[PDB]
Amino acid sequence: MKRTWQPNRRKRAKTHGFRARMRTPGGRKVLKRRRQKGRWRLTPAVRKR
Amino acid sequence: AVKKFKPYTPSRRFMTVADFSEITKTEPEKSLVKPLKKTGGRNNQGRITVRFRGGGHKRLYRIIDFKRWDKVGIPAKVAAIEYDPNRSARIALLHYVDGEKRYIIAPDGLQVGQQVVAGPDAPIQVGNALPLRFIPVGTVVHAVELEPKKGAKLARAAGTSAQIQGREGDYVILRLPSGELRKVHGECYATVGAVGNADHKNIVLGKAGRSRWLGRRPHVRGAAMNPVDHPHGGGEGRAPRGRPPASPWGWQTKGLKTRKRRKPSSRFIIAR
RNA sequence: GUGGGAGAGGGUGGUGGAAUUCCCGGAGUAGCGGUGAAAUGCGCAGAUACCGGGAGGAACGCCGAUGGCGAAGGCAGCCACCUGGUCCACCCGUGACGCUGAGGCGCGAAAGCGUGGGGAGCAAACCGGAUUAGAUACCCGGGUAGUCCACGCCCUAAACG
RNA sequence: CCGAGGGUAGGGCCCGUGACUGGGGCGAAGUCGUAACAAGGUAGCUGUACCGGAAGGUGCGGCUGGA
RNA sequence: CGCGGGGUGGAGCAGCCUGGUAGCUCGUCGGGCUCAUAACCCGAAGGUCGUCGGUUCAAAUCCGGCCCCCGCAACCA
RNA sequence: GUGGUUCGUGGAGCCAUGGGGGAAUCUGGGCGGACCACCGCCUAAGGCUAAGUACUCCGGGUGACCGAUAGCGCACCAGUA
RNA sequence: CGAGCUAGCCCUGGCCAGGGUGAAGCUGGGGUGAGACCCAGUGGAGGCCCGAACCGGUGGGGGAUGCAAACCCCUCGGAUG
RNA sequence: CGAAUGCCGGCAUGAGUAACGAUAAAGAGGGUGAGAAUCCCUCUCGCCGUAAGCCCAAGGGUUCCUACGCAAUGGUCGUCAGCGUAGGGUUAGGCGGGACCUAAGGUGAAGCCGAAAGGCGUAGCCGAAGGGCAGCCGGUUAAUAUUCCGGCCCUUCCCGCAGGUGCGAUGGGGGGACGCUCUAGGCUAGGGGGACCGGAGCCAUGGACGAGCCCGGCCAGAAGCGCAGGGUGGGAGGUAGGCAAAUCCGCCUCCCAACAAGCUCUGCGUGGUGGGGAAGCCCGUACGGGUGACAACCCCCCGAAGCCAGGGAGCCAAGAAAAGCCUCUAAGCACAACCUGCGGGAACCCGUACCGCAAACCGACACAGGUGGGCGGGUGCAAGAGCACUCAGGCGCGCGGGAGAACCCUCGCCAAGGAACUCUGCAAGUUGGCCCCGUAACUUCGGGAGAAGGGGUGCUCCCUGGGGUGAUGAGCCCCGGGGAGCCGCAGUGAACAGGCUCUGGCGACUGUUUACCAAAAACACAGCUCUCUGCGAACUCGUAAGAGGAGGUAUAGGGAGCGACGCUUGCCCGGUGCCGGAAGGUCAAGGGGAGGGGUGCAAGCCCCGAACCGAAGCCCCGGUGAACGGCGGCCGUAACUAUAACGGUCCUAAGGUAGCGAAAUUCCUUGUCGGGUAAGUUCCGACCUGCACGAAAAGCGUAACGACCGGAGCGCUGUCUCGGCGAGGGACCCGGUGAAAUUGAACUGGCCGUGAAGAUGCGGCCUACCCGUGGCAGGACGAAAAGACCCCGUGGAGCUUUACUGCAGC
RNA sequence: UCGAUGUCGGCUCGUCGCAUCCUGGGGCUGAAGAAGGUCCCAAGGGUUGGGCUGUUCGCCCAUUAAAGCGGCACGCGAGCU
Ligand SMILES: NC[C@@H]1O[C@H](O[C@H]2[C@@H](O)[C@H](O[C@@H]3[C@@H](O)[C@H](N)C[C@H](N)[C@H]3O[C@H]3O[C@H](CO)[C@@H](O)[C@H](O)[C@H]3N)O[C@@H]2CO)[C@H](N)[C@@H](O)[C@@H]1O
Ligand SMILES: [Mg+2]
Ligand SMILES: [Mg+2]
Ligand SMILES: [Mg+2]
Ligand SMILES: [Mg+2]
Ligand SMILES: [Mg+2]
Ligand SMILES: [Mg+2]
Ligand SMILES: [Mg+2]
Ligand SMILES: [Mg+2]
Ligand SMILES: [Mg+2]
Ligand SMILES: [Mg+2]
Ligand SMILES: [Mg+2]
Ligand SMILES: [Mg+2]
Ligand SMILES: [Mg+2]
Ligand SMILES: [Mg+2]
Ligand SMILES: [Mg+2]
Ligand SMILES: [Mg+2]
Ligand SMILES: [Mg+2]
Ligand SMILES: [Mg+2]
Ligand SMILES: [Mg+2]
Ligand SMILES: [Mg+2]
Ligand SMILES: [Mg+2]
Ligand SMILES: [Mg+2]
Ligand SMILES: [Mg+2]
Ligand SMILES: [Mg+2]
Ligand SMILES: [Mg+2]
Ligand SMILES: [Mg+2]
Ligand SMILES: [Mg+2]
Ligand SMILES: [Mg+2]
Ligand SMILES: [Mg+2]
Ligand SMILES: [Mg+2]
Ligand SMILES: [Mg+2]
Ligand SMILES: [Mg+2]
Ligand SMILES: [Mg+2]
Ligand SMILES: [Mg+2]
Ligand SMILES: [Mg+2]
Ligand SMILES: [Mg+2]
Ligand SMILES: [Mg+2]
Ligand SMILES: [Mg+2]
Ligand SMILES: [Mg+2]
Ligand SMILES: [Mg+2]
Ligand SMILES: [Mg+2]
Ligand SMILES: [Mg+2]
Ligand SMILES: [Mg+2]
Ligand SMILES: [Mg+2]
Ligand SMILES: [Mg+2]
Ligand SMILES: [Mg+2]
Ligand SMILES: [Mg+2]
Ligand SMILES: [Mg+2]
Ligand SMILES: [Mg+2]
Ligand SMILES: [Mg+2]
Ligand SMILES: [Mg+2]
Ligand SMILES: [Mg+2]
Ligand SMILES: [Mg+2]
Ligand SMILES: [Mg+2]
Ligand SMILES: [Mg+2]
Ligand SMILES: [Mg+2]
Ligand SMILES: [Mg+2]
Ligand SMILES: [Mg+2]
Ligand SMILES: [Mg+2]
Ligand SMILES: [Mg+2]
Ligand SMILES: [Mg+2]
Ligand SMILES: [Mg+2]
Ligand SMILES: [Mg+2]
Ligand SMILES: [Mg+2]
Ligand SMILES: [Mg+2]
Ligand SMILES: [Mg+2]
Ligand SMILES: [Mg+2]
Ligand SMILES: [Mg+2]
Ligand SMILES: [Mg+2]
Ligand SMILES: [Mg+2]
Ligand SMILES: [Mg+2]
Ligand SMILES: [Mg+2]
Ligand SMILES: [Mg+2]
Ligand SMILES: [Mg+2]
Ligand SMILES: [Mg+2]
Ligand SMILES: [Mg+2]
Ligand SMILES: [Mg+2]
Ligand SMILES: [Mg+2]
Ligand SMILES: [Mg+2]
Ligand SMILES: [Mg+2]
Ligand SMILES: [Mg+2]
Ligand SMILES: [Mg+2]
Ligand SMILES: [Mg+2]
Ligand SMILES: [Mg+2]
Ligand SMILES: [Mg+2]
Ligand SMILES: [Mg+2]
Ligand SMILES: [Mg+2]
Ligand SMILES: [Mg+2]
Ligand SMILES: [Mg+2]
Ligand SMILES: [Mg+2]
Ligand SMILES: [Mg+2]
Ligand SMILES: [Mg+2]
Ligand SMILES: [Mg+2]
Ligand SMILES: [Mg+2]
Ligand SMILES: [Mg+2]
Ligand SMILES: [Mg+2]
Ligand SMILES: [Mg+2]
Ligand SMILES: [Mg+2]
Ligand SMILES: [Mg+2]
Ligand SMILES: [Mg+2]
Ligand SMILES: [Mg+2]
Ligand SMILES: [Mg+2]
Ligand SMILES: [Mg+2]
Ligand SMILES: [Mg+2]
Ligand SMILES: [Mg+2]
Ligand SMILES: [Mg+2]
Ligand SMILES: [Mg+2]
Ligand SMILES: [Mg+2]
Ligand SMILES: [Mg+2]
Ligand SMILES: [Mg+2]
Ligand SMILES: [Mg+2]
Ligand SMILES: [Mg+2]
């Protein structure tokens, strides 16, 4: 039947986006750590135009 | 009135509709004086505070005039009488001679063509509005104010009305659609007559949908759910509450009074 | 036809005071209530009795009658509107247009019923108190529908002269 | 084609029968109480309404076939 | 089988738990009123207290053994 | 009414303080574990101050530390696939 | 950290083949004092009917290291709300 | 280190075993090639065809095209590919999105709140498949085209000249601007026919040179007409309203029209012109190109759900916003500015490849699954997006070859019987569309109803009534009627297409739910009652602000229960709850100091502390049951027995009423009578001795309705007696690829014993050459899951309450 | 035996014991004969279809020579239900 992953570019940047994470105190920390851990990608790689 | 139906479908037998004869060939509302976008929504910021709402026909707000000392002395002619989805009372639209249009909740009687007005002057006739003092003790009246300049608030439901009782200082005793004798200030307007369309209390919704149309989702009894989400809940085949009847949140609901005790509004009240 | 007569005939609208019950204020105490007698009941939390104010519902005292009105049921404070039957005088108009009347049809007390409004008094059911062998009764104290209004039903009667 | 009659399907009236059940009539001396006829010891009778072992009681209106 | 409740004049109930004292309503018997019966009035009678044991000076009453009676439990499989 | 100190309301001070009350300028004030007298000690309601102390992303040195299943998760284009 | 599954609501758009049934209402006819009302014709109502898409998921069989961590065949519910 | 269902790594066992992923289907010829069932081409066959075809959106991100290539990826092969390597390929003022607008929502100056983080938030900003905005048809590449070329046609902008006008706002007013169902008129899309026109071509096999077969007979298109249609009255005075000002709008009054006459604005024809243009035939593809060709390019009929569109009518549940747009004036400006022409110049940023019901997206997979909008031809069946075949177009599902066992799956049929099957007619059958006769109880008058039960259905010929389009006609297309006759076993001849009834339980009804074992009698539902709430309402979320409630106001909103409707819902307020009690009793902090203590020489300073004053709550006084609930026991009596209307008596707060009652409630229990049956632990009707019904945790009924649950009969049947045969997919054998759970090691028989009491393994005896393949499931206490039951642990959670103790709240 | 020995019934398949239901022998019989009663010998084979119940068992219904009773993990769920 229908599954749980229904990709959607908008929803994805809108939710796990970078400006998205900067906006909140908890998300900014999410960035810190990922930066502090090394992670090549701080946030998901949404795309297209 | 109240239209009836032959049983050509169970439900549309007991079903009963209103009679919109009193509706002056109007229907399409009046831009300008209303309508405004009406933000429908069953909960506040986030959560749902009143339960069981949502869904139900889209609606446009008819921005009515609920404080008439706006036009003291300026007479206006009642133009139409139309339907208002936001209330039980039908409403009358009227053109002042000032050239301004505005709606008023329509009183029983008031016919299209009639002239109506407000102010200390104003003749005591259906439609006219005046400060409570200047109104004849005993006359009935609707659309009362509670405090001078704050707008109408009592007897505005379909065909409801309040009767003046006496005077007493800068105050005048009323008798609200509920039976409470209240002391209102003299300077509160109150347009004379009863609200009209009193057949409203007689409409037999009819089916399940009918309720759904007016935006009210099904209502489930506490008795149906479990202990986790309401007092009356569980365990076997039905069961007699098992304690003093209570609400989802738990306070008694078969008798417990609510008005907050030490309210300042107490002293101006006298009844039930 | 013409000109008059009495009437609680009928419908809507409006209104008057008396009484009642209830609330508030007052003053006032030690009992009121009820009965054949009592008790139940009510009452120092302050009754009953009396004054003052207000609320509300119903029913209209004397007039009033062994009276009037109506086809019956029935109809009663008072004001108006809308309206029905009927009596008289005049003998002027039509000119036999009449009597009854299966059916249909309407009207039809009280009780009851439907939806809604109203609720003071009273009052089936009901609860208590006495009476009683026993009382599901006649007496008493509480009391619900109902009694009241609107529309719709009901159609019965010792609807009896 | 018509057609006696037969077959299948469903109806209309009628009669018989049916555990059980509703009142009813009749049946010399059983139980319970007082409803009625004398003001029947609560005038009765009454249409209706509810209640009660039972007569019956009670509200409401009514009638004299009562004061 | 198990839990606890109960056997009292003819009927239905008290009386114990703080042992010595059996009480109430009806019914039954005798007498009255009535023509007579009921009602009502006046008096009177009737109880090995389920039984076999002992506990104490003394048991309806305290304690164990059985005879019926009533109610409650007989769950997980 | 509470927190701090070893102090859990204890004879409960001292130090901070939300609430109510509400002084004084040396013959003034707080303290020395309820209190009071004595004897003393210090001078609240403003602020600044290196140093000796902590840490080790980073540089260097040394190891009765590991030696590729160990040693960092990664000796290797690993916070990757 | 999650409402890209799911639940509910808010905003803005889309979809529902074809056939049944025939409400009110109008029109006329009868009918009365005027009514009620009875007829036709018209009309096109409805959590109305048969039934696709579409939404379900009733019974049975299959499948059970499957085609599939919910599927397949037959059958069946709804389908202008 | 041998153990931890240990950790990691490797290799074994099962096994050449199961499998190789839809029963839509394959055969051959010729190529290419180291190597062909698997690649290319041709012929024949099969499958889809409201898709298995094509157009979009999403998502994916090079998968597109072309060259060379098969190591690996492909469930086999591979010369092939979505795979490897290389290079190439995606063109825009007009399609989409941005230099336009607003929706919910997001953000947020101001303001408010919060220990901090942060929460709120009218202005504005942000936010789109919604509003607005200018491209149609053809030609080209191996791959792009509403993009490039071609032909016609638009749009803003800036600068000019020519001419008009009070010009001018982020501001005023207009409009934009709206539901649902049903719809008319006239068009277009698309489609059927043509004796007419255009075409290579063809007489086959008995007949046909025929008004024969086969093929095709359009597409875009400015202005102007034309046919449809959508919008809109023109004046002139008065003005105190549209938070300034308006000449605008609005309202009042006097005129002239009420018409669309007139102005507009779309659509559709037609239009200068511009294109396109089959079958066949010839070739060479991996494909497309020539010719057919000066191709014709005409006439009917069907006809939308699409266009005219802001059309109409009906209804109730009463149906976004803002810009652009027109108009209005203000500040300013009127040498500006703006409008109409006409020239010339400027017109930016991003998407375009390809897959797109799928081998390219979501499911670890080249997965029988999920996936949103448009088109979706023909015929036939009553209609249709249905069904059967077929256009176009795309496919034969990336293992094959044989065999013809049992057994399984899917399918077909059957003598006689037909439900004897079984927990149950579970399953399968019969029934089946439309037309016409014809239909009971009951009923809330609609329904029950497709009730039941019947008959008709094909084709040919004759006669004959109505429409539509054309003219009042032929034709083409629609509905009909009557009458003769024909062929089969059979005419909705295949495909799609209810078995019927009788009677109980429950629920009134449509609905809803345990995604992934329960779809129900459960939830919901209209409706009935209680109750809270006077509005800064109650209530809910929040520390607050704040909001919701509600831009509501008692005819309304919250909570509770019952659950259409019919007829009804009885008694008890003792206990608990809630409601009413300016008495009294109790009642903390606080007031108050009687009186007492500690130090002081002391004045003083520090404590204890009784009177009495002291809230709510509790107590007590009252009511309240559609509030929490409760609604008895034992003895006796009627003139046959019986039985008890009657009576006695004990304790209640009162002491179950009507109605129903072997029940979804009945233990004893197949209670006992009656009915159905040859027979009835069920079923239906009764009786009542109701373990243990009973009135809004409703009672008793109820027409209609249900994939709900029980009984019965008819019909039909492979359910059964009782099987049998046939079919295809596997199973079997051959070729290719090649798993798995399990596994202390194994050289693993039977019996009677024995053993921790169920032995291949120990004892005795019996049997028994070694190793396989198709099968069966009796055993290995077989596999699977550290039993889900039970107990244990002073283990853990969810739930409850007059358990304790706190807390929010009041 | 709880690091699992799946459990009532039925169905399919059976096998065994005899303390035998039938049939076959036999002794006594209060056994005339026919039919029986009873014990003894003896399992070789046979041991029906139904209605009710989940049912085991019963109860019936129509027959029968008879309508036997038990074990095999209340035999048999890696065989079904
Ligand atoms: N025929 C009388 C009708 O039935 C009823 O009456 C019947 C009964 O009430 C009545 O019973 C009576 C009883 O009332 C009275 N107080 C005592 C008497 N012994 C009984 O008598 C009855 O039984 C006996 C013996 O069997 C018979 O012989 C006698 O005929 C019969 N009446 O007997 C009557 C039948 O005979 C109605 N009450 C009466 O109004 C009505 O008219
Ligand atoms: Mg938020
Ligand atoms: Mg509910
Ligand atoms: Mg539940
Ligand atoms: Mg709870
Ligand atoms: Mg409960
Ligand atoms: Mg229960
Ligand atoms: Mg004369
Ligand atoms: Mg007459
Ligand atoms: Mg009456
Ligand atoms: Mg009433
Ligand atoms: Mg009263
Ligand atoms: Mg009274
Ligand atoms: Mg009385
Ligand atoms: Mg007496
Ligand atoms: Mg009457
Ligand atoms: Mg009668
Ligand atoms: Mg009379
Ligand atoms: Mg009979
Ligand atoms: Mg009969
Ligand atoms: Mg009889
Ligand atoms: Mg008497
Ligand atoms: Mg009497
Ligand atoms: Mg009578
Ligand atoms: Mg009475
Ligand atoms: Mg501390
Ligand atoms: Mg101090
Ligand atoms: Mg010190
Ligand atoms: Mg010091
Ligand atoms: Mg410092
Ligand atoms: Mg390592
Ligand atoms: Mg590592
Ligand atoms: Mg009609
Ligand atoms: Mg319809
Ligand atoms: Mg429907
Ligand atoms: Mg359907
Ligand atoms: Mg070891
Ligand atoms: Mg094997
Ligand atoms: Mg094999
Ligand atoms: Mg195989
Ligand atoms: Mg690539
Ligand atoms: Mg390719
Ligand atoms: Mg390969
Ligand atoms: Mg594969
Ligand atoms: Mg090659
Ligand atoms: Mg914006
Ligand atoms: Mg947009
Ligand atoms: Mg565009
Ligand atoms: Mg392409
Ligand atoms: Mg201007
Ligand atoms: Mg403007
Ligand atoms: Mg504007
Ligand atoms: Mg030939
Ligand atoms: Mg051909
Ligand atoms: Mg053209
Ligand atoms: Mg319209
Ligand atoms: Mg607007
Ligand atoms: Mg804007
Ligand atoms: Mg730019
Ligand atoms: Mg492109
Ligand atoms: Mg493309
Ligand atoms: Mg594949
Ligand atoms: Mg879909
Ligand atoms: Mg189509
Ligand atoms: Mg199809
Ligand atoms: Mg057969
Ligand atoms: Mg046959
Ligand atoms: Mg059977
Ligand atoms: Mg059987
Ligand atoms: Mg059955
Ligand atoms: Mg079936
Ligand atoms: Mg049934
Ligand atoms: Mg049923
Ligand atoms: Mg239902
Ligand atoms: Mg669902
Ligand atoms: Mg489920
Ligand atoms: Mg299911
Ligand atoms: Mg309410
Ligand atoms: Mg909130
Ligand atoms: Mg608010
Ligand atoms: Mg609001
Ligand atoms: Mg319910
Ligand atoms: Mg009750
Ligand atoms: Mg109480
Ligand atoms: Mg009580
Ligand atoms: Mg009480
Ligand atoms: Mg107090
Ligand atoms: Mg029975
Ligand atoms: Mg019971
Ligand atoms: Mg019940
Ligand atoms: Mg109840
Ligand atoms: Mg119910
Ligand atoms: Mg019932
Ligand atoms: Mg349903
Ligand atoms: Mg269902
Ligand atoms: Mg078979
Ligand atoms: Mg085969
Ligand atoms: Mg052994
Ligand atoms: Mg051995
Ligand atoms: Mg085995
Ligand atoms: Mg096997
Ligand atoms: Mg095992
Ligand atoms: Mg374990
Ligand atoms: Mg258990
Ligand atoms: Mg413990
Ligand atoms: Mg175990
Ligand atoms: Mg094991
Ligand atoms: Mg013998
Ligand atoms: Mg056996
Ligand atoms: Mg056993
Ligand atoms: Mg057993
Ligand atoms: Mg067994
Ligand atoms: Mg099994």
From Swiss-Prot, chain A:
InterPro entries: Ribosomal_bL34, Ribosomal_bL34_CS. PANTHER family: LARGE RIBOSOMAL SUBUNIT PROTEIN BL34M, MITOCHONDRIAL RIBOSOMAL PROTEIN 34 FAMILY MEMBER. This is Large ribosomal subunit protein bL34. Part of the 50S ribosomal subunit. Belongs to the bacterial ribosomal protein bL34 family. NCBIfam families: rpmH_bact. The open reading frame (ORF) for this protein is entirely within the ORF for the RNase P protein (RnaP). The two start codons are separated by four nucleotides. The keyword Glycosyltransferase does not apply. The keyword Plastid does not apply. Residues 26-49 are annotated as: Disordered.
UniProtKB/Swiss-Prot annotation, chain B:
NCBIfam families: rplB_bact. InterPro entries: NA-bd_OB-fold, Rib_uL2_dom2, Ribosomal_uL2, Ribosomal_uL2_bac/org-type, Ribosomal_uL2_C, Ribosomal_uL2_CS, Ribosomal_uL2_dom3, Ribosomal_uL2_RNA-bd_dom. One of the primary rRNA binding proteins. Required for association of the 30S and 50S subunits to form the 70S ribosome, for tRNA binding and peptide bond formation. It has been suggested to have peptidyltransferase activity; this is somewhat controversial. Makes several contacts with the 16S rRNA (forming bridge B7b) in the 70S ribosome. Residues 256-272 have a biased composition (Basic residues). Residues 229-239 have a biased composition (Basic and acidic residues). One of its GO terms (biological process) is cytoplasmic translation. One of its GO terms (cellular component) is large ribosomal subunit. This is Large ribosomal subunit protein uL2. One of its GO terms (molecular function) is transferase activity. Part of the 50S ribosomal subunit. Forms a bridge to the 30S subunit in the 70S ribosome, contacting the 16S rRNA. May also make transient contacts with protein S6 during translation in the 70S ribosome.
